[model samples]
Target chain A: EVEALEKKVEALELKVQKLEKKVEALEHGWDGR
Target chain B: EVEALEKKVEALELKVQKLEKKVEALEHGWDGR
Candidate 1:
């Protein structure tokens, strides 16, 4: 399941710095899901 | 669909330390998806 999500996330990644921002982006990106 | 992903991640989250580990887990969890 994680792998799948990662894949999806990565897929979008095919689309960052600031670890905080990175985290947020990641967190948000997931939320944006 | 970031929101959906976040939801799923958060859902699993309902399920950490070591910033490195945290990132890895988050990264891996998504991969584990």
Candidate 2:
């Protein structure tokens, strides 16, 4: 169903958003304090 | 500085959360539905 698919897509989008943040840090080379 | 490192860790944490979502989806076999 459309609703079900949207839920999946939203979850994917949210996950991607989170990954981008950490990837950004790693890409920028954080020293980790 | 310590503040800089803290920010980095936070960013990293954020990213891990995102990765976990996809890993969960893929592991569970979402099938893009």
Candidate 3:
């Protein structure tokens, strides 16, 4: 049970990472603009 | 699968925004100090 593969948690982590990067890029571009 | 990306992805987003906020806060404190 310790090694259970939770696909949803993995998906959420992926989504959060993507959103974080997008926000970072927008902030960077805003700095230059 | 038309959508493509890999799992075990690199999680580092960027240092810019976080470092930017730190820099701004430091500058503010410098101004006040």
Question: Candidate 1's residue-wise lDDT over A1-33, tens digit each?
Answer: 667778755544332133355467567776552
Q: Is candidate 1 or candidate 2 better by lDDT?
A: 2
TM-score per model over all chains:
0.29, 0.46, 0.37
Per-residue accuracy of model 3 over B1-33 as CA lDDT, tens digit each: 111223332232243355456456544764442
For model 3 the local lDDT of residue A28 reads 55
Off by over 4 Å in 2: A31-33, B1-33
Q: Compose the digit string of candidate 3's lDDT tens values, residues A1-33.
A: 212334544665676667556555654555662
RMSD of candidate 1 to the true fold? 14.9
| Models sorted by lDDT, best on top | 2, 1, 3
Number of the candidate with higher lDDT, 2 or 3: 2
- Every model's TM-score on chain B: 0.40, 0.82, 0.44
Which ranges in model 3 have alpha carbons more than 4 Å from their true place? A1-5, A30-33, B1-33
Candidate ordering by DockQ (highest first): 1, 3, 2
Quality of candidate 1 docking, DockQ: 0.07
DockQ of 2: 0.05
- DockQ (Cα-based) for each candidate: 0.07, 0.05, 0.06
